[PDB]
Amino acid sequence: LERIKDYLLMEEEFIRNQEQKQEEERSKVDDLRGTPMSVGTLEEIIDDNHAIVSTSVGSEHYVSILSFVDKDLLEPGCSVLLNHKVHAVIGVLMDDTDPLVTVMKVEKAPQETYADIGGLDNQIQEIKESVELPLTHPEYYEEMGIKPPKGVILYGPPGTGKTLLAKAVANQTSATFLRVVGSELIQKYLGDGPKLVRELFRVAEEHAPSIVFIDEIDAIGTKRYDSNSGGEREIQRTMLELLNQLDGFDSRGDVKVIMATNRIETLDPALIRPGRIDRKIEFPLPDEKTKKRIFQIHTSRMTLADDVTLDDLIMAKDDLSGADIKAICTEAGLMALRERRMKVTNEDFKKSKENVLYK
Amino acid sequence: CGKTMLAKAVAHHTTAAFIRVVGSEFVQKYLGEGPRMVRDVFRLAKENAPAIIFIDEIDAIATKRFDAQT
Amino acid sequence: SYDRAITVFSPDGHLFQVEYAQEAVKKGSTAVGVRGRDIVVLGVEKKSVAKLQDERTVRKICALDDNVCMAFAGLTADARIVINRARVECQSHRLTVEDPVTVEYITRYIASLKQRYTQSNGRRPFGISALIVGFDFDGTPRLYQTDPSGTYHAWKANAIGRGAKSVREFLEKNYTDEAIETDDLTIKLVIKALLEVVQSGGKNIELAVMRRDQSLKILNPEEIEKYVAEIEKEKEENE
Amino acid sequence: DKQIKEIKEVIELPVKHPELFEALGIAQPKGVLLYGPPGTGKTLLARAVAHHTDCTFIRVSGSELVQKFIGEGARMVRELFVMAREHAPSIIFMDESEVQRTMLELLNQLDGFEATKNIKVIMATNRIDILDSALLRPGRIDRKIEFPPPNEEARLDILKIHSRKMNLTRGINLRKIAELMPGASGAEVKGVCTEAGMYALRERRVHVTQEDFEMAVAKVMQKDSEK
Amino acid sequence: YDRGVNTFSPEGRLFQVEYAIEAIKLGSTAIGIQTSEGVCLAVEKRITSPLMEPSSIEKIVEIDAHIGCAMSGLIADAKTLIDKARVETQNHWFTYNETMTVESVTQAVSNLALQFGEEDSRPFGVALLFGGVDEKGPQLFHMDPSGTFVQCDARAIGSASEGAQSSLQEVYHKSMTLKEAIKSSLIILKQVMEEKLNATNIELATVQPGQNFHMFTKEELEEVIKDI
Amino acid sequence: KGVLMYGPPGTGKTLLARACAAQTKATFLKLAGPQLVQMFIGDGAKLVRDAFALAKEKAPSIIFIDELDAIGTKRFDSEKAGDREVQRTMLELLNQLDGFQPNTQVKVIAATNRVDILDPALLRSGRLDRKIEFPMPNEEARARIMQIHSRKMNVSPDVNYEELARCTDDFNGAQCKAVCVEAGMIALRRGATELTHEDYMEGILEVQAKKKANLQYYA
Amino acid sequence: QVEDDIQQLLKKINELTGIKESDTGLLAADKQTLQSEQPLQVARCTKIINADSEDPKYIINVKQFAKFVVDLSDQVAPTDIEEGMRVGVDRNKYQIHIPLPPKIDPTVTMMQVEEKPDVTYSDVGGCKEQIEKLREVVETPLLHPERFVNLGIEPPKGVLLFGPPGTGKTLCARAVANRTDACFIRVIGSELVQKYVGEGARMVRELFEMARTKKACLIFFDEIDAIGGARFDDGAGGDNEVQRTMLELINQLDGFDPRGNIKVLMATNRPDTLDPALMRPGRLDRKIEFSLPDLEGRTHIFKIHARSMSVERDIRFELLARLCPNSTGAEIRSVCTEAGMFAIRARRKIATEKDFLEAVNKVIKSYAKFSATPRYMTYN
Ligand SMILES: Nc1ncnc2c1ncn2[C@@H]1O[C@H](COP(=O)(O)OP(=O)(O)OP(O)(O)=S)[C@@H](O)[C@H]1O
Ligand SMILES: Nc1ncnc2c1ncn2[C@@H]1O[C@H](COP(=O)(O)OP(=O)(O)OP(O)(O)=S)[C@@H](O)[C@H]1O
Ligand SMILES: Nc1ncnc2c1ncn2[C@@H]1O[C@H](COP(=O)(O)OP(=O)(O)OP(O)(O)=S)[C@@H](O)[C@H]1O
Ligand SMILES: Nc1ncnc2c1ncn2[C@@H]1O[C@H](COP(=O)(O)OP(=O)(O)OP(O)(O)=S)[C@@H](O)[C@H]1O
Ligand SMILES: Nc1ncnc2c1ncn2[C@@H]1O[C@H](COP(=O)(O)OP(=O)(O)OP(O)(O)=S)[C@@H](O)[C@H]1O
Secondary structure, eight states: OHHHHHHHHHHHHHHHHSOOOHHHHHHHHHHHSOSSOEEEEEEEOOSSSEEEEEOSSSOEEEEEBOTTSOGGGOOSSOEEEEOSSSOOEEEEOOOOOOHHHHHHEEOSOOSOOTTSSOSOOSHHHHHIIIIIHHHHOTTHHHHHTOOOOOEEEEEOSTTSSHHHHHHHHHHSOSSEEEEEEGGGGOOSSTTOHHHHHHHHHHHHHHHOSEEEEEEOGGGGTSOOOSSSSSSHHHHHHHHHHHHHHHHOSSOOOSEEEEEEOSOOTTSOTTTSSTTTOOEEEEOOOOOSSHHHHHHHHTTTTSOBOTTOOTHHHHTTOTTOOHHHHHHHHHHHHHHHTTTTOSSBOHHHHHHHHHHHTOO | OOSHHHHHHHHHHOOSEEEEEOGGGSSOSSTTHHHHHHHHHHHHHHHHSSEEEEEOOGGGTOOSOOOTTO | OOOOOOOOBOTTSOBHHHHHHHHHHHTSOOEEEEEOSSOEEEEEOOOOOOSSSOOSSOOOOOOSSSSEEOOOOBOHHHHHHHHHHHHHHHHHHHHSSOSOOOHHHHHHHHHHHHHHHHHSSSOOOOOBOOEEEEEOGGGOEEEEEOOTTOOOEEBSBOOBSTTHHHHHHHHHTTOOGGGGTSHHHHHHHHHHHHHTSSOOOSSSOEEEEEOSSSOOEEOOTTHHHHHHHHHHHHHHHTO | OHHHHHHIIIIIHHHHOHHHHHHHTSOOOOEEEEESSTTSSTTHHHHHHHHHTTOEEEEOOSOSHHHHHHSOSOSOSTHHHHHHSTTOSEEEEEOOOHHHHHHHHHHHHHTTOSSSSOEEEEEEOSOGGGSOTTTTOTTTOSEEEEOOOOOHHHHHHHHHHHGGGSOOOSSOOHHHHHTSSSSOOTTHHHHHHHHHHHHHHHTTOSSOOHHHHHHHHHHHHHHTTOO | OOOOTTOOOSSSSOSHHHHHHHHTTTSOOEEEEEETTEEEEEEEOOOOOSSBOGGGOOSSOBSSSSOBEEOOSOSHHHHHHHHHHHHHHHHHHHHHSSOOOHHHHHHHHHTSTTOOOSOOOOOOOOOEEEEEEETTEEEEEEEOTTOOOEEOSSOBOSTTHHHHHHHHHHHOOTTOOHHHHHHHHHHHHHHHOSSOOOTTTEEEOOBOSSSOSOOOOTTHHHHHHTTO | OOEEEESSTTSOSHHHHHHHHHHOOSEEEOOOSGGGOOSSTTHHHHHHHHHHHHHHTTSSEEEEEEOGGGTOOOOOOOSSOOOOHHHHHHHHHHHHHSSSSOOSSEEEEEEESOSTTSOGGGTTTTTSOEEEEOOOOOSHHHHHHHHHHTSSSOOOSOOOHHHHHHHSOSOOHHHHHHHHHHHHHHHHHHTOSSOOHHHHHHHHHHHHTOOOSOOOOOO | OHHHHHHHHHHHHHHHHHHHHHHHOOOTTSHHHHHHSTTSOOOEEOEEEEOOSSSOOEEEEOSSSOEEEEEEOTTSOSSSOOSSOOEEEOSSSOEEEEEOOOOOOTTTGGGBOOSOOOOOGGGGTTOHHHHHHHHHHHHHHHHOOSHHHHTTOOOOSEEEEEOSTTSSHHHHHHHHHHSOOSEEEEEEGGGGOOSSTTHHHHHHHHHHHHHHHSSSEEEEEEOTTTTOOOOOOOSSOOSOHHHHHHHHHHHTTSSSSOOOSEEEEEEOSOTTSOOHHHHSTTTSOEEEEOOOOOSHHHHHHHHHHHTTSOOOTTSOSHHHHTTOSSOOHHHHHHHHHHHHHHHHHTTOSSOOHHHHHHHHHHHTTTGGGTOSOSSTTTTO
């Protein structure tokens, strides 16, 4: 019976939250402000309620401030509001929006969940207990006062499901996802690596609890590009900036970091020390049992003609991955809709096997 | 290898209007006068006649690498 | 010749190539072996055959004497070299002392060769790990394993190859003295251990035994099929 | 025509009927790779099919002019997707280690994980063995499409297309012209037509006869030994 | 960055020998104690598995009928040296009708503790404790990979040698007896080992002028352990 | 026309510059090396020429350059890449120094740590006239330097500098100053007021910068 | 319920009760003061070239407009209008009013620390001599200029640190930055790498501008290998801008009027590719190094990471330390946390010894193939 009184008083508090002369004061603030509100740029701040700004041409002025908005929302390199007639600081401007953010932040529910992963069951609980169970259930760690594991390296041969695992963590989540392929840290201008790194982790630390997933980072060392300045003596400095940004100073925060490689032996081991990355997880070519789950799930949504056996396909290649399985399970469908059919026969799989593997 | 020698002979034997252009002449001190000079050359070219433009050394212009900061 | 030292110590106290050549063993086929008290048994798993070809040349279990038996892991070529040298050594021992060659001698020879092989000038260490099962005088079954370091090291059951931790964990919860009471049960115990290992289709299950007063018998893969069938029958009888 | 059927089945079929794929329940494809000798139709096929299926053709290869039109030139290359979300039925196409890196970022986005569909990628290159093995994971590219050098009937069709703009003459044998070519490219027959026009022009004539074509064949086969 | 293996240091030592002195430290512990009644000695086996049959691991091996030994860390580099040391003691008793004293044994070993090279390969990786009873009474001897051989009255090696040397200098003096030193060693053992001390973990080796040969079969170890 | 210093990095070359500043009452003019490096193309030449002009109009003019190798770099003809503008500033320095329109009112002192970096036109023989090498302090000079830097500190007068100089092998003057100062602070560790010879010994042991790792088992 | 409904009633009673003052009382918190700031001035800032004689007669470059000859107003001091001084100048009559601090290049403003990360000296135990020496250099002259004056010495104005990675360098720096009391200024070594030639030089200039303005401050350099280590000279012209940045770092550090009340701490992982101009003392005096914690260090670091966690205190820690011969504190931290994570596999509230043994054979023996220090102990 607490619903009635609680709802009445809570709605009164919500209507008093909207209940916060007065219109005359709004008109006076509008009188102080000019109508063509010009935009400036801070350079420094002087503590006597007037500071230096910088116009769009370069002219700079010691101007006072119309102090009702929080001026302490502003730092060097900020955007202000200025007048034409006296150039005074009209007030704060909300921040410009947001090409790096909109590019590097995955906004949407991004694909299928753990119902699609093919029989791992042990790697999954490790990445679960490193990201999901810490973040979504932050109650066990209080009991033991143990900080969560920081970094997770996924590695293994190509085709095993690093990308799937990242997408599945990004499915069931509560944090902002940040995706940068590691090959975008090689720029044709000098000194552009550390700028990308500092902007990336600035975005991460300013926005939210987050997951920064950095994929195929091993290609930063074993791929020299002609579209570059002096290669290795800039790449090394970029790696050093990534290093210092990852485990440097000033209370790192609520940022999770997951990285994924093909090869691991060409990495500078200074990233691979603990304190930065605590979990290193192998992804092997699985077995001949969880392959049945992979063929099953990648044939779970199709009109499979039951004259085929999946054990004919398991035995076929001795070191096939889930990449090969997806490739055959889609190429057989491409052979199916080539001849206006619905169900898929055995020779479709035969042609798909002879198309994917041996070409 | 005799590059401008042939444009010289073409300027001699022709009847058409012939406009020589220094390559680096477009980039100048005042802002925006370059594209305006491009407009100038092409408006006069459209005006005159069946005509011939020779622009020497467009390596001053066509450089495949830029820097949109400077 | 090649005046160089391939294998250098680490800055933190290792031999890179001895500890690292164990990985080549770690990425080979699995093989177990136990001793009963009167019948010895061993066998390899994961032949990973093409199911449609010859199989008399891929035999991973051989013998050096009429008394001693082999198994290995890792890569097969170094095993071929070590087996050739071991055959020569055991027969040369028979040249001298008129006994049948003791198993402890041939394991010391293999481990000694392996260590002076790792020590020497520019020779790459042997990335294998053998199993040497034999029952010398007065019928005593014993079994030793090797290591790329060269440490002969007597066990009671085996744990090598791929996923040896799982297999030794099954042998850990399966150390029953009852299992080595019935020779047939010891054979079935190897079959159940290797069944708690890989596919174990009854195709790559190559096993050979010796009843210590005979030579090695390679079993025809229909008897192993009935062994797996009665193992599945006992597994149904567990419920 | 077979390559036409392939690109039909892989691009026109997702656009006009997504629910065929979603009824059969596989991944709708996202990648096409074109190979062959350079000069055999690597561009016209892609541009043409993208024109007929009503998709905004986009060819971003390597300029900085392009890097000013897309964004402000600041940091990366992914802002093409920001301009591609606004014209969602669109196709991205490229020429020949840089462009392969570009394709790596492109595919690494739209391999199931970037957006709603209607965005695809096409590379045209030559000599498949010169590219990355990490690109050659079989779960990465969906179709690989061959362009053979043209045959007698193929060059005949090419000639009967490119001859349709000239001032020809009756009683001309085109199959002789096609069967004097040493398996030329799809680019060079257009050169034969243009040089035939030039040879007719220098005679102060208005029609084009077979002599001009045969001398153009001689000219192009003389240019074939230039590098 | 791979330099030549026979390079000294910027500070002075070498490299590879120093890395050998580091490589000792991972090995199992051992404790030997000189007493005028005779030399006693102890070791830990470090049993890993129950499948691992325990009586086959050798730590105390036999050089002569009166010269004992114990090894550490790498097993098989030690096995070569043990074999060769035996051969050279047999050469001495043969060509001299007398017993090669323990110091002369260890001089013969550390003559080629460092002959590591590319012509005429790596340094060996074992620390050794040498005992026995020569004419100079009991002797306890300790060498290293660097050949820097010294006499020690009661040296403890390997992984737990810091607290072993410290707590050993706590309990040791000059006029100890045998059995007191035996239990004084195994107290230190079951303070420095990890597993429960029982019949299968450790093994002793004592050689006396009276108890003429080093002889130590099983289950007197049981009687010694139940005396704790 | 001009004097160059060069040598090992701790023999002291800033010292003579500050010395001649302390003694000669001309317009002594300092110039750091990379201060002639500019971002905008064509300001380093302006900077060099303005420096020489302000030297000329204050006619007794001693111009000091420190680390001339910052702008002094051996040129090269390559493609696709290459530093240019710094060589332009270097050529401006050369020509406004020597060549056309010579002068008698300029005095130039340069000092690099390494010699082989420079273009031969920088030195040629009339740009920087007197090549002056600096050696390491031999025996007595080390004792002289340590005796100089021990001046303000209260030395107990039972300290033989000869022992110190004969055991400080292959040091510079800066390392000798480091020896003396760290000896003072090692004496300040135990809190004793005036120094002792053992403090100097331990200061030498600290300046040598051993990296051990516990070497004890010798002899 | 009763607390919830009664707190809703009380808080909303205060809210709807002050609503009477909200609807009865009819920004202006500064409005009259801001309109008295309307007789104030726009005050454009400038830069001064020089003065003239017998009179003020000042000469100014504004920034872009022109250069004007001006006069001072009456509310100034005729002294502190020296050359190269950013002063605020009237827009109408062009007259100087107030001198100000110079240009600071605001991308350099954001590397002063402005906070204090909480790292105590207790977190680096087992490194007592290193803590002692670094204390002696950094802490003691800023808090006690007593022994250093009454005996007549100068403290070493520079200290470099090195060792294997993950050994405590960063952590010791933060431990100082807790109890610093000075203007601690962070510098990442990659901050001096910009697109344009000689730009990082100007960054170093502005660093020492800030350093000379504020007395008794600290500057921390971090991973100085990016700043520049060697002057490898070839017929290619490769790494050179970094080299000029390094030389400008040399000269404005120490030489020809030295630095003042500033102390520099550098920290590298590979102190071997360094030009010996940095190795000259007078710039980088004490070579404090971090080796591995030998035996008792790891016992103490187990006491550090174990003192505030749920364990079973009946176990020992020495046996845990005896299995970690070449290991860093980072690996110790991973051992402790991973033993906790094995306790999360079951549902317990206290660790076991077996949990720590799982942690040891999980971290050390398994990931010892990577292990980060078989090729940095040699300082490659
Ligand atoms: N274990 C698996 N179970 C099911 N499908 C799998 C599995 N592994 C891979 N796949 C398939 O492979 C695709 C994901 O590719 P990945 O294996 O993650 O490629 P990748 O090799 O990780 O690429 P990288 O990270 O650059 S090497 C999915 O669309 C699946 O169809
Ligand atoms: N037939 C000829 N072949 C070569 N040189 C000739 C010929 N006739 C005259 N010359 C002379 O050589 C010059 C040829 O060079 P140019 O015509 O200037 O070519 P170009 O302008 O120098 O090309 P550049 O060097 O790349 S800008 C002529 O200007 C004449 O002085
Ligand atoms: N199917 C065709 N039949 C006849 N001519 C063709 C055909 N396709 C292309 N051409 C002509 O040949 C030229 C070159 O063909 P493209 O389609 O551009 O291939 P491509 O651009 O040469 O491939 P590259 O050079 O490796 S990027 C075109 O500009 C057309 O004039
Ligand atoms: N007579 C002397 N000989 C050598 N060094 C001395 C002498 N007197 C003082 N010093 C020390 O020399 C130091 C100056 O060394 P530096 O000037 O740094 O070396 P350098 O000559 O400048 O080489 P750089 O730095 O490449 S220009 C001073 O700090 C003094 O402590
Ligand atoms: N001696 C130590 N005692 C206690 N904790 C330590 C010790 N060394 C390292 N740690 C812990 O491990 C972390 C890593 O040390 P850091 O100094 O941050 O590594 P680092 O200085 O970044 O090394 P790099 O990679 O060469 S910059 C520290 O922040 C501590 O949490």
